Each structure stands twice: as C-alpha cells, then as structure tokens.
Design an enzyme around this catalytic site. Structure first.
Site, PDB file in Angstrom:
ATOM      1  N   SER A 139       0.857  -1.171   0.000  1.00 45.85           N
ATOM      2  CA  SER A 139       0.000   0.000   0.000  1.00 45.85           C
ATOM      3  C   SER A 139       0.908   1.241   0.000  1.00 45.85           C
ATOM      4  O   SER A 139       1.861   1.333   0.792  1.00 45.85           O
ATOM      5  CB  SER A 139      -0.826  -0.014   1.255  1.00 45.85           C
ATOM      6  OG  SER A 139      -2.004   0.726   1.099  1.00 45.85           O
ATOM      7  N   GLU A 140       0.625   2.188  -0.876  1.00 45.88           N
ATOM      8  CA  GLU A 140       1.534   3.322  -1.113  1.00 45.88           C
ATOM      9  C   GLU A 140       1.511   4.344   0.035  1.00 45.88           C
ATOM     10  O   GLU A 140       2.400   5.160   0.156  1.00 45.88           O
ATOM     11  CB  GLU A 140       1.236   4.022  -2.445  1.00 45.88           C
ATOM     12  CG  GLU A 140      -0.208   4.479  -2.663  1.00 45.88           C
ATOM     13  CD  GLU A 140      -0.998   3.568  -3.629  1.00 45.88           C
ATOM     14  OE1 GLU A 140      -1.049   2.314  -3.404  1.00 45.88           O
ATOM     15  OE2 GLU A 140      -1.587   4.136  -4.604  1.00 45.88           O
ATOM     16  N   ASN A 141       0.503   4.282   0.887  1.00 47.46           N
ATOM     17  CA  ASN A 141       0.520   5.066   2.094  1.00 47.46           C
ATOM     18  C   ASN A 141       1.470   4.558   3.200  1.00 47.46           C
ATOM     19  O   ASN A 141       1.523   5.147   4.287  1.00 47.46           O
ATOM     20  CB  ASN A 141      -0.890   5.226   2.624  1.00 47.46           C
ATOM     21  CG  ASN A 141      -1.595   3.894   2.866  1.00 47.46           C
ATOM     22  OD1 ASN A 141      -1.539   2.983   2.046  1.00 47.46           O
ATOM     23  ND2 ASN A 141      -2.319   3.806   3.975  1.00 47.46           N
TER      24      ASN A 141
END
Lengths: 464, 466
Positions: B296-298
């Site tokens: 997840s890019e967060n």
C-alpha cells in the site's frame, strides 16, 4: 525473504565481475559469514562497494587479501595496508567518494533515482576530476569531471546512483519473511545497502518467527531481502579499544577548553576524533549537547567502562563508545541527510592545512565525513589544530598546498596559540592569543597574512 | 526540542506567506490541533504542502475554508470541493505532483538535495508543463506549470524535479520524549515521516509524552534533532473516511470474472500493489496458502482484509482511505520509503483500473495524481496489468488506437484484462488478443475495441481461478 542453512548455497549464483555492496563501518556490522562464503567460492574481479576496506584480512579485507576484488568504491581505506599496497602497485582500482555521497548514491540507486545533486565535493577534486583511480605511475584511470548546477544561489555537484548485482548485509534479527532489525551502530551502511541490489543477502544472529518483529519496529521490510542466513560464532572485535602529566596534553586541553566555549544548551554537534572529542569532556554539568556521529548515532557518550564495551557501539573513529539517555540510532544515509540537510548546528574538526580564505585540506588515507560536514549549509565549521607541524612549519597558509576538503568553508580556527575568525573567501582575523604568546610569535608561525583584531584578547578557557 | 503546553505559543512565529508542510494521508495522521492553532491565529497566504486537502473543514481543509491558504502543493485534492471551488474561482493556486515525487521532493529537501531525477511523470503533463496552476477571477490562466528538464540515464528517460524545504512542518505522531524523539503508530506515519525532516522549524503533535529513555534507541522513528517543538493533544477526532467491515450483484458479476482472471497472475512469494476497485477484489481469490504480500503506497507492506466492526482503527487504512487490517509479518514505513520501494522496482506487479488504454500501452486517468498511478506504472521491471470494463454499454470503446485523455504513463502497460478479452502489449508497438471469455467471438472483440490488434493464432478461452 527465504532462509538458507548454508552460506555457500547463498552465494552460489554470484558471477565474476559482479558489483557487490558490503555493509559495515570499519569492522562494525560487517557481513563476516557471507564474506567467508565468497572467499571459499573464489569469485573474482569484484567491484566492492564498501565504506572501508575492513583491516588486513577482516571484512572486505578478507577478499582483497585473496585478490578477488578488482575495484573498491568507498570513502576511507587507510586502515587496510594490503589494500593500499595493491592500489599503489597498480593491482587494484580505488574510487573514493565522500562518505555521505556514497550513502546517498546507494539510497538513490535503491529508490530508482539515477542521479541527484549534492553540495559535497564542489570545488574539489571530486567535482574537478583528475584524482587517480588506477595505476599500471603511470596513472591509468583518473576520475571524470562532474556536472555542476546552481540552486537558490548555492552550487551543487551532480552525482550518479549506485545499484548493484548483490548486497551482502549484516543485521541482528530476521523473521522468515525477511523483515530485519539492526542493533545499535552496526546498522550504518547495511540500512541503505540492503535496498540497492538485484539480490540481497542478510546475515543475522537470530531468526524469530513471523510476528515476533512487530510492524512498527521493523527497520528493513522483507521485500528488500531475498536470502537470509543465521551465522553463529561471530568474531566481533572493537578496532580501537577505549576505556574509562603532561605538556602536549595540556596544549590539547587548552585548545579543547577554548572550543568548549562554543557549546550552548540545545545544540547539536559533530566532533571529529582527536581534539574535537576531548572538548566534550568540558561541557558544563547542566548543559545539554547532543553529539552526532556520522556512522549513525545521535547521543554519543563517553568511553564505556571495561564491562560495557560493545563492538556494535563505536564512534566514527572506530573507538568503543557509549550513548546517553535519549540516544537514537539510524542508517548512514539518514545520518548524512541530517548533515547535508543542515540539521547539525556546529562541526569541529582537525586539519593538515587550512587557508586564509577558509579553505580546508585533510584527505591527501581518504576524506570520509569531512567533506560532507564542511559542505553543509548553515553549519558552523570550527577547525581545531596544532598551530604548526613539529618542525613547524606553518599549517595555516595563504593557499593550501594539498587537495582541498572544502573551499571557503571554515568559520573559526583554534590553535594552542591563537584563535582566528574567517571571512570565508576573503581572510583571517586574529581575535585571541593564548597567555605567554605574543602576536609576533603568531606572525612568525603563521604563513597567512591576517588582520589583528582591534580589541583582541587573551584566549578564553572554560572552567574545570 | 521542547515541550509546549500551549499550541498557540507553538505557532507564534508563523508569519504570513509561510510555506508549511502538513502531515497526513487523507484524514489519517493529520496535525489536527496545530491546524486549529493556526486557524485561531489567522495566519494568511500559506503555501500548504500536503498530500491531500483533507475534506470539507478537516485537516488542511480547516485552513482553506478560512481562506488562509493561497497555494496548495499536493497530489490529489478531489474530496475537498471547497478547495476545488476556490481553484476554479481563481482564489487559490494548485500545483499537483505525483504522490511519490511529492514524497521524494520533501525527503530530498530535508536531506539538503535541491534536485533529483525520477521516471515518474515522463511523457505526461508533469514533464510537458502547460497545466493551469492559478486562474485570475476572470480567468484566464495566470500561472501554468513549466516544462521540466529531462535527461537520460542508462538508456531510460527521467524528469528533473526540485526539492521542497519549508519554513515550518506540522506533523502528527503517537509518542514523544522531551528531546523530541518520535514514534508513529501504524499507517498514520505516511508523509509525517519525511515532512518532519524538511523544514526550518518542525512542530510535532502527539498523544503521549514519555520520559527520556522510554523510547529505546533502536525503536525511535524520528530522531529528536529534527524536531523543535512538541505538543500533546488530547481529544482527537480520528475518523475513517471510507468505513469498510467484514460481517460474519449485477456490475459485480463481471467484476468477479475479471478478478478471477487476474488472480491467475499471482505466484507464491510475490509482491504486488493493487489499486482500489477490481484489483483489490482479486486478492480475495488467492489460493490458500499461496503467499502474496500486498503493498500500500501510504506506507504498509502486508495488507489484510477489512477489519471486523470491533477492530476498526483509523490509523490503519489502505490507499483508497478504507479501514483495513494487516497480516502477520506486516511492516509500516513512511511515504518516501513506500515510493522508493516502487520507483526502485522492488514491487513485482501492479494491477490498476483505467478510463482509457492505448494500443501501444499508454494509460490515461485524470480528465498529479487515484494513487499513486503515475509512480506505479513508471516503475522499472514491474509488471503492469490493467483491469477494466471493455467498453461502455453504447459500444464506446475504452481500448483505443490513441488515448483522448491526458496520460498517466506512455508505453507502460503489459497486459489488459477486460470481461471479454485478454491482451498482451508489446509496449510502444501494439496489442495481441490472447484469450476471449466464454460466449464471445473475435468478431465481437473487433467490434468493441477501437484499437487494431493481432489475434494470437494461438488464442484460448479466458481462464478463471477456482
């Protein structure tokens, strides 16, 4: 991740000519077991990316001894004489790189950033090229000139990333997914290195089950790591043991008792080994000074008692050290971000030579931390040195004879005789003189012209 | 740095015209109390660097509502309509930046690196410039984006980007000690990690203050040197923006076929990033116990399923802002680290939706910027799979010869999976039909589909995972 019971299986696909990253600072946090596996395998013609060359026959030195390395990219290779021996004899290439640029080249390579700009090296042989990489005299390969570019009125050197075939890295614990945790200052280059190779191999001292490394405590996510090995009889040594009369002493102490005055509560400083470190000993009782170490520590303490010596805890000069309450540990890339980013208030270093305009020369051995430290923006640079060279022989010149570490970089020069302030690029100003010396003795032992401060005084000395 | 018992004292030297970083992804990990302190102080003409604009009157939205912000640098600002309203009316400048480039600009700024090269944005408006940043109230584009320099390394093309280094950074964390060492909780790290290193002055709000020593040296996330001022807030209004629960349909039926086809692309050991919508759906069909770690890019590696009602955590969300969980062996990290992982090529496969797709592998969304997408598809040695409905009901093709819309990437896609057909792409050259769903024929696929394509003489029926 994936666990290997045998090291030699772990390096089985390492080709001749491979570019290989090796973690470790000095002999701290080195990938001992994988290095022996590579030795046993006899792979040849390695470009070894490592900060140092270990020492004779330890760390990367194990492989240089067996002539398995045809080039070394690093920042400081002095302590390995065999390595120097091969460099001079023309058997081995050496590309020196400022330590912080090495760290960022690797961090950038693993982050898919092929080049970036840094102020470190500007107006030096690093930017200018011509430094000798390989002898066959005759100099067979010398360093290429680097592009420069100006931002916000300051100058920067363009540097290209590093991304290797393999990375051999050392840590404390792994889970079987490859999540890693490092112990203390043994992190150093292992942190960035394990992100910057096609294949990464981590040796560790403990394997824990999935879950045991909690998600908010993992230092390296397992995605960065391909192979895991648990070594078990680690030959962890301290390179320069240090544990907790006389005139040359008392001069060193005068110098230190003078720089001590530059400390204020709340300050963040980096102290080079030798005199700068000595001055920490004179920090007034109540005052809070957090000392940064470029190998990845904030909160350096005094040398440990005999019973607290830890090989995973050393300073930039490879001495066994301690930390104060509130210390933090981090990677070599993070360490130099701190510095290059201007977050350190003051830097105190030694020097071989210093110039009237603020120039510094003290790497031509190797340059390591110094270039980065003195290139950092909004960072006070103080040089602490013996005023003369023994036969003295001025060390404070009009222009340096040696290769520069930085140009127009120093703010203050403190010898055992005198204190100067520098208007960078312009000249010196004598502002203090130690008791017993006169301005005529300082004129005579100083090659550089200087203006004598109206209202100079006696050199100050911190109490106690 | 030092503890403040009063937030207003903490922002006392923030003048008009300040560039200010604000941590947070969506409404996760936002500096709520210092944002109110700034509101209360009434400082004007702020350039707010933030990934998102919060929503109406939360996070950075609190300050836009009161007209305190003259410019926003970020990656995605839909969700705050007031903010868009002001952009259009000409009241407010907006510079969009791919989310990964934002993260690195900030990381680079705090590391004293004034510029760097990245492949994200190449051959798009980001590189080409010409996008409107500021309208005048009549307007009429008053400020538009400059074309960016490009340079080639090792045969690939890169865009040059300049760092960000701000006057102030307002950041959120879980604990501080009085030296300023910080620790973050879960996915609330995100941009707070890099932001707190990239300003002349940093202010950290936290939920707990512990004594010196309580944060052990090998567990500290941010060393105190980065932080000047510390504030303990105490009644935090932590929300999840898109609630999602697991509790022990018509368009959904074609969505499942598509997902049941992409599921086949998973292998044990693989690292994947799944966009919201169809790509996520396909996680549900991973053969147990094949091991797939979802990024997840967060700032998360190890995304799990939606939490049960009683395990919802606002500090734990996916890139689509949905409350989520993590599997055993998960790790958390900053937004800079997350995109390093991606830009550096370390994620094996990416699966995303699209509005349009081209014959040569081009990808378009927009209408910078949602994700995540530009960074993901620009990543080297990363398999890019697009999952989309093949056309609109009126037979409007979405697979074109050239895209009509602004590109997310050029020559970027590897595989296209619709409900009707599967293509492979030879990037830059053309499509190849390799599978066709039960019940359809090549003539159907020719008739939907704007793009010419070569039919695999060796085509088959579209596979479907168990």
């Amino acid at each position: 991740g994936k666990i290997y019971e045998s090291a030699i299986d772990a390096v089985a696909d390492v080709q001749d000519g491979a570019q290989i990253l090796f973690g470790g600072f000095g002999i701290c946090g080195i990938p001992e077991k994988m290095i022996n596996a590579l030795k046993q395998k006899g792979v040849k013609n390695i470009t070894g990316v490592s900060n140092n060359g270990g020492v004779d026959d330890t760390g990367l030195g194990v492989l240089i001894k067996q002539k398995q390395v045809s080039k070394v990219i690093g920042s400081y290779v002095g302590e390995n004489t065999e390595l120097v021996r091969q460099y001079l004899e023309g058997e081995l290439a050496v590309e020196l790189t400022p330590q912080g640029t090495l760290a960022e080249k690797i961090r950038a390579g693993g982050a898919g950033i092929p080049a970036f700009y840094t102020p470190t090296g500007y107006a030096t042989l690093v930017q200018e090229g011509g430094a000798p990489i390989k002898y066959s005299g005759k100099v067979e390969i010398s360093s290429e000139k680097k592009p420069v570019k100006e931002f916000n009125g300051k100058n920067y050197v363009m540097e290209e990333s590093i991304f290797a075939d393999f990375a051999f890295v050392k840590a404390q614990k792994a889970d079987p997914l490859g999540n890693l945790v490092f112990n203390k200052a043994a992190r150093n280059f292992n942190a960035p290195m394990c992100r910057a190779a096609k294949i990464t191999v981590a040796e560790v001292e403990e394997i824990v089950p999935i879950g045991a490394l909690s998600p908010d405590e993992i230092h390296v996510p397992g995605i960065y790591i391909n192979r895991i090995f648990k070594g078990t009889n680690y030959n962890k040594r301290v390179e320069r043991l240090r544990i907790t009369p006389n005139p040359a002493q008392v001069l060193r102490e005068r110098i230190a008792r003078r720089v001590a005055l530059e400390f204020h509560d709340g300050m963040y400083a980096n102290l080079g080994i030798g005199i700068p470190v000595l001055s920490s000993n004179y920090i007034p009782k109540g005052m809070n000074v957090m000392l940064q170490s470029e190998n990845g520590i904030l909160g350096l303490g005094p040398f440990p008692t005999k019973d607290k010596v830890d090989p995973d805890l050393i300073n930039a000069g490879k001495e066994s050290v301690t930390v104060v309450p509130g210390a933090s540990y981090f990677g070599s890339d993070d360490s130099f971000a701190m510095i290059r980013g201007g977050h350190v208030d003051i830097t105190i270093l030694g020097a071989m030579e210093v110039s009237a305009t603020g120039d510094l020369a003290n790497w031509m051995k190797g340059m390591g931390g110094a270039m980065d430290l003195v290139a950092a923006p909004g960072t006070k640079v103080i040089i602490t040195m013996e005023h003369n060279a023994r036969d003295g022989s001025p060390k404070i010149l009009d222009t340096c004879s040696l290769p520069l570490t930085g140009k127009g970089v120093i703010d203050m020069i403190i010898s055992e005789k005198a204190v100067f302030t520098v208007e960078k690029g312009v000249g010196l100003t004598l502002i203090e003189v130690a008791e017993g010396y006169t301005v005529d003795d300082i004129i005579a032992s100083t090659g550089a012209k200087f203006t004598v401060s109206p209202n100079l005084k006696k050199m100050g000395q911190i109490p106690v």
